[PDB]
Paper text:
Ribosomes are one of the most conserved molecular assemblies, and at the same time they are the target of many antibiotics. Amicoumacin A is an isocoumarin antibiotic that was found among secondary metabolites of a number of soil and marine bacteria. Amicoumacin A is the universal translation inhibitor since its binding pocket in the E-site of the small ribosomal subunit is highly conserved. In contrast, it inhibits eukaryotic ribosome movement along mRNA during the elongation stage of protein synthesis in a similar way as it does with bacterial ribosome.
The structure of the amicoumacin A complex with yeast ribosomes was determined by X-ray crystallography at resolution up to 3.1 Å. We prepared the crystals of 80S ribosome as described and introduced amicoumacin A by soaking at concentration 200 μM during post-crystallization treatment. The amicoumacin A molecule was located in the E-site of small ribosomal subunit after manual inspection of the peaks of positive electron density. Amicoumacin A interacts mostly with rRNA residues in helixes 23 and 24. It is involved in stacking with G904 (G693 in bacteria) in the tip of h 23. A small shift in the position of 2,3-dihydroxy-5-aminohexandiamide tail can be attributed to the absence of mRNA in the present model.
Author numbering:
A (entry chain Q1): 1 to 25
B (entry chain D3): 2 to 97
C (entry chain D7): 2 to 82
D (entry chain S2): 34 to 250
E (entry chain S0): 2 to 207
F (entry chain D2): 2 to 130
G (entry chain C7): 2 to 89, 95 to 126
H (entry chain D6): 2 to 98
Write the structure that this text describes.
RNA sequence: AGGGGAUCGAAGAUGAUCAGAUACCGUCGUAGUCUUAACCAUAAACUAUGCCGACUAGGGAUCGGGUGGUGUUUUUUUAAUGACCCACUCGGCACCUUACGAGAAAUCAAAGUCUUUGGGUUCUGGGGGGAGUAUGGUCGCAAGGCUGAAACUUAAAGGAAUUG
């Protein structure tokens, strides 16, 4: 998959793990 | 001169810089991080002696086709569980 | 080429080179003595002006500056040394 | 029967030239392999490596066969033949021929002292074919030839008794390494050492002295 | 060994200026040419023809001095040099080559153009560049008729001349053939204007 | 900016020989350059050379024969102790029978065999073969 | 489309090469030559061969033809060689540039002197 | 690998030119990477010139051609205009023909 | 290239280029030897007598074979001017 | 956060096309596009090519400075100028041909002067994937930026060139 889209993939994937973690802050 | 400082007084930079890039060596890193002692089922020991939990037929990878007959083992100094192959036709009838 | 005399180069091809690329470097600029028959005596001028040089007694003109050797003014003569 | 062409071919069969060192002295190019046969009978070949290569043709597939041969005595003459042909025997035949034309001399020498009969090299020589550099270093007597078995045989045929070697590149490609070691030994006689500073008179050509006893009909 | 009166005489000096052999190439000048004498205004450079005559004497000095005169190869692929070399070849030993060179002549014994000369003479190392290249594989010396732009790689002993056309080629080859007969040869004494006419060279017409 | 005046000298000399010339103009000479050029010439690797005097640091015209394969400068001047001169010559010299490492002792700029005879040691300048 | 093969044009080459003082521009006699002088395997190849050597013969009589030089022409051109008497010491003096004449006085001596200037 | 020494086209010592829009597909494109064809053509054509003066006032009139500069996008220049494609060697030649 | 006691060992002392004093070695087939024969009273090029020069293939390839030959011959006296040591 | 908001136009909605068509094409058009005040700090931010110095090779154009000329064109009365022409010299943006030389090649006046290995200095890389992920620190309003692992997995991944 396009490197750019593969990058946007984990950009999203990170902001979500960022989310779930802060719910336990 | 492309890079490395050639001056007579540059030793400090020279060892510092080499000390740095040794970490790209896989073995130097492993030996100093103590990955032997930290990770890995054996302690860094040559061998380790566990106890057989189950017996597994393992499905072999391509482009082979076979059933590899291993044993799940719990290391006695560890409790770490490990799957291990039993070589030489038969020899699965040798364990239990 | 491939063999030649770097110690005694021809005076023709030393003359075309840059003033720093000669065999022993030196200037290409000269000094001159200028007169404008209104005045009897002669001021000495550098070939490359910068300052616009005025004569001894009367304020007249001599040369205006340039990016280079000064343009001398109108009726004038010059010797060189 | 031979039946030469090339004025140089005649003059050798004409018995007017005894040794190839004459030919090297005058840099005369050899086109007739029989020249270096009569000039060097004691040549023994060695077939160094044979490997298949493959071309894709608009009809079919050609897999021909590449062979690498090395000839020499062991007195200071070697040659590197490499030939590709669609039969292993045929490629070896033509390869030994090219190894003939290619023969070049070697300047041996003494390690550290002036004693009997040079066992080693005049200088350090390096040569590089493709990606490989083979470096040849003067060595004490009885050090042997220190080289991988391929390079060792090319050096042994060349006549070298004791030499140190080092290589750099992809040396597992056997073809580029030998062409490099060949260029390495071939460079011993391009190296100007003080003993060769003495001026020689410039000898007269065999193509002139024997000029009448050469040329054509 | 400077002979005596082998100097360039006005009998010859007139000849050269007649064909404009002194009139050199235009703006193009290879850095390899001291052979100039000042420069004419408007594009032209004057060739120093004593250095031409002195070189032509040296070419003659090498041409003769080949034990068998018949392998000394004169070459022109130019049309203006073919009438000359054939007329050079006839007078001296000199196996000629005119027209097409057929590369692979000095390598490749198998060809039917095959020569093996101990010397080579060439009119235009641009047009004849194949010959110059081919000789440099086999250790073959090369004389050359060279203008101010000529590619002096792999030519020794260049004869500065004008290959822009006309009678110069014919002239230089006429003098070259003339001076190799005056050397060791069947020719004669000093002034010796030499019976053969100089227009016997010169690619003709139309 | 110029970090070794010796360096640019030796390099330019080598580009003469490599390009097949018979002479080279080096700049801006020096005391160290001269005594280097002397050690070469006194074993014959170059011909006569001429210091020309600009009122600046100087120039040199070296005449070279073509017996010279390489001259080069060891750029950090390492200290050599009398038994490591073995290891220097062995590294960069073509063979044990000729060629010299030239170094700087308190006994002055001298080649390595003169150093071995006079039994002084020092730093290392360069080499010539 | 009638285009002779190489074997035909190749054999005509060697034939006119060495047998020119024989043959002719008549096909019929050349045909009979190729029997007595040459070994061909069929009547058709021979008439084809001979028919083309007749054509190559027919045009050699006017102008040379590439591929056949029987060495007879090279000494036909040697005996054909002459031209001139005019040359090129008339009329008057040699007209030279300025520097051309300066080139004379530098190394030289008496030369007829006519000089011109030119321009940009 | 690298297939041109001019890279796309004709930019050395700038680092930014300014884009133009392609006449055909409107695709923006650097001015020096574009491909320009001057369109100079008479207003009328081959045919209508004779019937022009025939129906026209004035002797012979004037005939004022129209000039407009064309800018193509590569891909649009390729689809029609100066392209073909060239051999590895024939590419180098900048000769217009 | 002598040996322990005196004896010449190591076959084949090579030629040398006349311009550069650099060895000419067997596989340089771009090298050259120019034979210039001596003359005598009133023409007459004297077969079997030469002043010879050997120029390495290097120099010939670099385009210096001509101008380098002038210097060589003129210094041996078979040219008078044509060559200038200054530029 | 104000202003501006002609144009074009992420989003969204539409007309088509499609098996489908969340698209490519057509329409509408929000944000945006412009500006001020302040953030952000990233681009194939590319010459995918650190900087200073030296040396090694030819050629014709050209931009800027300068020097030389009983040069051309400008008429007036010669000039003075200006624009031009020709030669040289610095310092640029590039092209051309060479290849001594370098390279795995493509190619390269540097990517050269390198096993004949040392002018000065900064930085980065050490099989592929894991992964620019986790974690800590730090900067940011945010989007995110800098710093940045390991476990495990794996015999290739990759570069240039050749023939199909
Ligand atoms: Mg909560
Ligand atoms: Mg890392
Ligand atoms: Mg389990
Ligand atoms: Mg315990
Ligand atoms: Mg093997
Ligand atoms: Mg691609
Ligand atoms: Mg940019
Ligand atoms: Mg939508
Ligand atoms: Mg829809
Ligand atoms: Mg579709
Ligand atoms: Mg970045
Ligand atoms: Mg003027
Ligand atoms: Mg596998
Ligand atoms: Zn005044
Ligand atoms: Zn477009």
């Amino acid at each position: 998959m396009r490197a750019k889209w593969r990058k946007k993939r984990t950009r999203r994937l990170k902001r979500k793990r960022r989310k779930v973690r802060a719910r336990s802050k | 001169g492309k890079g490395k400082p050639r001056g007579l007084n540059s030793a400090r930079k020279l060892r510092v810089h080499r000390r740095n890039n040794r970490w790209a060596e896989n073995n130097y890193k492993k030996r100093l991080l103590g990955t032997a002692f930290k990770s890995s089922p054996f302690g860094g020991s040559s061998h380790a002696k566990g106890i057989v939990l189950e017996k597994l037929g393992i499905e072999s990878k391509q482009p082979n086709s076979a059933i590899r007959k291993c044993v799940r083992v719990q290391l006695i100094k560890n409790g770490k569980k490990v799957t291990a192959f039993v070589p030489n036709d038969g020899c699965l009838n040798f364990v239990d | 080429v491939l063999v030649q005399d770097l110690l005694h180069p021809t005076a023709a091809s030393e003359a075309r080179k840059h003033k720093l690329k000669t065999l022993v470097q030196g200037p290409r600029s000269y000094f001159l003595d200028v007169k404008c028959p209104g005045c009897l005596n002669i001021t000495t001028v550098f070939s490359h002006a910068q300052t616009a040089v005025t004569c001894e007694s009367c304020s007249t003109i001599l040369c205006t500056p340039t990016g280079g050797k000064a343009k001398l003014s109108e009726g004038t003569s010059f010797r060189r040394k | 029967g031979w039946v030469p062409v090339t004025k140089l071919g005649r003059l050798v069969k004409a018995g007017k030239i005894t040794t190839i060192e004459e030919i090297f002295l005058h840099s005369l190019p050899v086109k007739e392999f029989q020249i270096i046969d009569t000039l060097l009978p004691g040549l023994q070949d060695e077939v160094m490596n044979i490997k298949p290569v493959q071309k894709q043709t608009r009809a079919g597939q050609r897999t021909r066969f590449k062979a690498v041969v090395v000839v020499g005595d062991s007195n200071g003459h070697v040659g590197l033949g490499i030939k590709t042909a669609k039969e292993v025997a045929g490629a070896i035949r033509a390869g030994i021929i090219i190894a003939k034309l290619s023969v070049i001399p070697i300047r041996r020498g003494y390690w550290g002292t002036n004693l009997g009969q040079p066992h080693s090299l005049a200088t350090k020589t390096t040569g590089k074919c493709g990606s490989v550099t083979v470096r040849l270093i003067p060595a004490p007597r009885g050090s042997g030839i220190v080289a991988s078995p391929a390079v060792k045989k090319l050096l042994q045929l060349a006549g070298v008794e004791d030499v140190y070697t080092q290589s750099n590149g992809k040396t597992r490609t056997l073809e580029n390494t030998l062409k490099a070691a060949f260029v390495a030994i071939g460079n011993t006689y391009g190296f100007l050492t003080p003993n060769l500073w003495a001026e020689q008179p410039l000898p007269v050509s065999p193509l002139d002295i024997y000029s009448d006893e050469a040329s054509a009909q | 060994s400077l002979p005596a009166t082998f100097d360039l005489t006005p009998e010859d000096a007139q000849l050269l200026l007649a064909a404009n052999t002194h009139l050199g190439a235009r703006n193009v000048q290879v850095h390899q040419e001291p052979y100039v004498f000042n420069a004419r205004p408007d594009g032209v450079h004057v060739i120093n023809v004593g250095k031409t005559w002195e070189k032509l004497v040296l070419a003659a000095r090498i041409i003769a001095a080949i034990p068998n005169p018949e392998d000394v190869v004169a070459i022109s692929s130019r049309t203006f040099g073919q009438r000359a070399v054939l007329k050079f070849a006839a007078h001296t030993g000199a196996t000629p080559i005119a027209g097409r060179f057929t590369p692979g002549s000095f390598t490749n014994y198998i060809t039917r153009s095959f020569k093996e000369p101990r010397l080579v003479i060439v009119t235009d190392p641009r047009s004849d560049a194949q010959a110059i290249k081919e000789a440099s594989y086999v250790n073959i010396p090369v004389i050359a008729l060279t203008d101010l732009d000529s590619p002096s790689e792999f030519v020794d002993v260049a004869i500065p001349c004008n290959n822009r056309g006309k009678h110069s080629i014919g002239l230089i080859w006429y003098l070259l053939a003339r001076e190799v007969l005056r050397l060791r040869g069947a020719l004669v004494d000093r002034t010796q204007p030499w019976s053969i006419m100089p227009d016997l060279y010169f690619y003709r017409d139309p | 900016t110029r970090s070794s005046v010796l360096a640019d000298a030796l390099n330019a000399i080598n580009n003469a020989e490599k390009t097949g010339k018979r002479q080279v103009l080096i700049r801006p000479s020096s005391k160290v350059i001269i005594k280097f050029l002397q050690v070469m010439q006194k074993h014959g690797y170059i011909g006569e050379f001429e210091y020309i005097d600009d009122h600046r640091s100087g120039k040199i015209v070296v005449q070279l024969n073509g017996r010279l394969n390489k001259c080069g400068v060891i750029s950090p001047r390492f200290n050599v102790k009398i038994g490591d001169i073995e290891k220097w010559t062995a590294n960069l010299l073509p063979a044990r029978q000729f060629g010299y490492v030239i170094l700087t002792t308190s006994a002055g700029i001298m080649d390595h065999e003169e150093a071995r005879r006079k039994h002084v040691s020092g730093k290392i300048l360069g080499f010539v073969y | 489309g009638r285009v002779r093969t190489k074997t035909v044009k190749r054999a005509s080459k060697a034939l006119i090469e060495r047998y020119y003082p024989k043959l002719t521009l008549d096909f019929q006699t050349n045909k009979r030559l190729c029997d007595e002088i040459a070994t061909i395997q069929s009547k058709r190849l021979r008439n084809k061969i001979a028919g083309y050597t007749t054509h190559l013969m027919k045009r050699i009589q006017k102008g040379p033809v590439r591929g056949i030089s029987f060495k007879l022409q090279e000494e036909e051109r040697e005996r054909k060689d002459q031209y001139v008497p005019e040359v090129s010491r008339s009329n008057g003096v040699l007209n030279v540039d300025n520097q051309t004449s300066d080139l004379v006085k530098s190394l030289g001596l008496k030369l007829p002197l006519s000089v011109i200037n030119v321009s940009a | 690998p690298k297939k041109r020494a001019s890279n796309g086209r004709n930019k050395k010592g700038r680092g930014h030119v300014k884009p133009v829009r392609c006449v055909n597909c409107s695709k923006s494109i650097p001015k020096d990477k574009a491909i320009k064809r001057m369109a100079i053509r008479n207003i009328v054509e081959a045919a209508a010139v004779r019937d022009l003066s025939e129906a026209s006032v004035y002797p012979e009139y004037a005939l004022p051609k129209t000039y407009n500069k064309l800018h193509y996008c590569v891909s649009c220049a390729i689809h029609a205009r100066i392209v073909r494609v060239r051999s590895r060697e024939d590419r180098k030649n900048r000769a217009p023909p | 290239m002598e040996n322990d006691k005196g004896q010449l060992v190591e076959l084949y002392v090579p030629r040398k280029c006349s311009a550069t004093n650099r060895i000419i070695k067997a596989d340089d087939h771009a090298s050259v030897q120019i034979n210039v024969a001596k003359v005598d009273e009133e023409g007459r090029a004297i077969p079997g007598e030469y002043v010879t020069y050997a120029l390495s293939g290097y120099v010939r390839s670099r385009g210096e074979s001509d101008d380098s030959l002038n210097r060589l011959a003129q210094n041996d006296g078979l040219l008078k001017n044509v060559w200038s040591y200054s530029r």
